[PDB]
Amino acid sequence: QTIRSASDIRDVFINAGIKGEEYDAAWNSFVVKSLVAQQEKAAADVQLRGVPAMFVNGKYQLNPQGMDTSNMDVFVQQYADTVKYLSEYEDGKQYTTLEKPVAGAPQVLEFFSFFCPHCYQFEEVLHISDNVKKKLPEGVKMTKYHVNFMGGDLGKDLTQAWAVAMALGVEDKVTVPLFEGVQKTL
């Protein structure tokens, strides 16, 4: 169940409960085609240099380097808070303001890769994700986009695979199995 190829990614989806026909149907769908393009554009729109990264309303970029890292606990609590705050802490510290705002951007957008070790931690060690969306205000959702500038050929397939996950609404079912399958390969 390690992920070294496209078919391996398919296997993980199947073992998550998505049937191969549904996966293939979505893999080749218009919506998924459109989602891979938008994942790429949205990264380009904020001039994304790397992951993990998080942006609020196309306006603000979370700045974990300007956060209290005394310990893990305090850091996770402050990160989930800055997200709460901005979705309603001084500029240049816990967050920065984008020069040219991205209109039409999701309320809260995280960028990640199944290849990125700090992304695996953010998601399944620090639980930054779970922790921010447990404090996220009502009517505000967290979106996650996969980036294709990591992992070569396999990275692009994972970006299209994620588009399928979003297309079918099975993000919660495959996130962990996908992180595990790629990180095990490391």
For residue 7, the domain's CATH number is 3.40.30.10
Q: Which domain holds residue 131?
A: 1-186
The enclosing H or E element of 96 equals strand 95-97
Report residue 176 as tokens.
């962990």
Q: Which one-letter amino acid corresponds to residue 13?
A: F
Chain breaks in the chain (C to N over 2.5 A) after: 88
Please say whether the beta carbons of 120 and 176 come within 8 A: no
- Chain mean position to CA 142: 9
In three-state form (DSSP H/G/I as H, E/B as E, the rest C), the secondary structure along 160-174 is: HHHHHHHHHCCHHHH
Would you give the DSSP letter of residue 6? H
Q: Is the peptide bond before 52 cis (omega within 30 degrees of 0)?
A: yes
Q: How was this model experimentally determined?
A: X-ray
Please say whether the beta carbons of 159 and 36 come within 8 A: yes
Report how many domains make up the chain: 1
